[PDB]
Design a protein around this ligand. Structure first.
Ligand SMILES: O=C1NC(=O)/C(=C/c2ccc3ncccc3c2)S1
Ligand code: NA
Length: 327
């Protein structure tokens, strides 16, 4: 069968912890007072939640309330525990409270409010400097959660809240996040289509933090090339074909060979044969001011089939692309 894989950083962080850190099922929630929060406006609906702007009437500060659906099948406890474990980390959304919603009767998570324009609305208008600046801020969040034994598994523009006026960023929606345990096989039905790593698309379950670095690379490519999304698959199958048209098929087949993966036979009729395109093929008059040799080398080192070969978040922060950003 498939050959096993282990993360090359933060491999055993959870194994050394007391079980309370990662055994989210045994976590006992401390409840706040639902009357502290008055709902202001409906912001939108998640797959398992509904999200509202609200006011904390005890300090009159804006907050956001995420009321979870009872269809969660025990997944509420995981998100709560992960949010509490990561609270205070750089650029991690702050869980301010947990209350029991009086109408739905499910847990409602209370977050700090971010005066964002949501990143997907903004990330196609940024200057070269601002792409580098905000990418570095996202990397602070990812290295923090990875170093804490957690993979986000849903990195995408919608899940990065950016207050562009104040140049502040928060990584949100930890509802798909999971604790990394070496040797564990995970569900591949995570992340959003355009940001899914090759490991998910080829059904390789023993993945790790490096999944988030693929998703980050997809965001970077969309920003520097002004192409939304960069890999524009019509479904999960065509998604891998779109990747192969850029990265080539012989490296894909080498990845499959290395991990002893049984490629879904459906790919035989759609993958074709493709050679890697040099990154300069995607440069044009409208995006060339966002492209530099450093940007292309950095992207090249994120968007690799082999999850063990991609830059880690800390390696990424060391890259020359960020030498221009004030630290
Ligand atoms: O589905 C979700 N999961 C989260 O973790 C969310 C967090 C969040 C935080 C702050 C916000 N500020 C303004 C507007 C929306 C906001 C949303 S929404
Ligand atoms: Na820097």
């Amino acid at each position: 069968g498939p050959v096993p894989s282990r993360a090359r950083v933060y491999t055993d962080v959870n194994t050394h912890r007391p079980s309370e850190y990662w055994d989210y099922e045994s976590h006992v929630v401390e409840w706040g007072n639902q009357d502290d929060y008055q709902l202001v406006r409906k912001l939108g609906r998640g797959k398992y939640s509904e999200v509202f702007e609200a006011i904390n009437i005890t300090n009159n500060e804006k907050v956001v309330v995420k009321i979870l659906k009872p269809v969660a099948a025990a997944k509420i406890k995981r998100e709560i525990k992960i949010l509490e474990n990561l609270r205070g980390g750089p650029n991690i959304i702050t869980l301010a409270d947990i209350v029991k919603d009086p109408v739905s009767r499910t847990p409602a998570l209370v977050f700090e409010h971010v005066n964002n324009t949501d990143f997907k609305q903004l990330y196609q208008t940024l200057t070269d400097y601002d792409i580098r600046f905000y990418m570095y801020e996202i990397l602070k969040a990812l290295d923090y959660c990875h170093s804490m034994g957690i993979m986000h598994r849903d990195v995408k523009p919608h899940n990065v809240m950016i207050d562009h006026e104040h140049r502040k960023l928060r990584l949100i929606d930890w509802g798909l996040a999971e604790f990394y345990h070496p040797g564990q096989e995970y569900n591949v039905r995570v992340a959003s289509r355009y940001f899914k790593g090759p490991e998910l698309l080829v059904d390789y379950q023993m993945y790790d933090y490096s999944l988030d670095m693929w998703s980050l690379g997809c965001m970077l490519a969309s920003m520097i090339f002004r192409k939304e999304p960069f890999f524009h698959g019509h479904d999960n199958y065509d998604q891998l074909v779109r990747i192969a048209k850029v990265l080539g098929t012989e490296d894909l087949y080498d990845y499959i060979d290395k991990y002893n993966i049984e490629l879904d036979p459906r790919f035989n009729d759609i993958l074709g044969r493709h050679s890697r395109k040099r990154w300069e093929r995607f440069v044009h008059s409208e995006n060339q001011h966002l492209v530099s040799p450093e940007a292309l080398d950095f992207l090249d080192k994120l968007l690799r089939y082999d999850h063990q070969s991609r830059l880690t978040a800390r390696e990424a922060m060391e890259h020359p692309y960020f030498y221009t950003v004030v630290k």
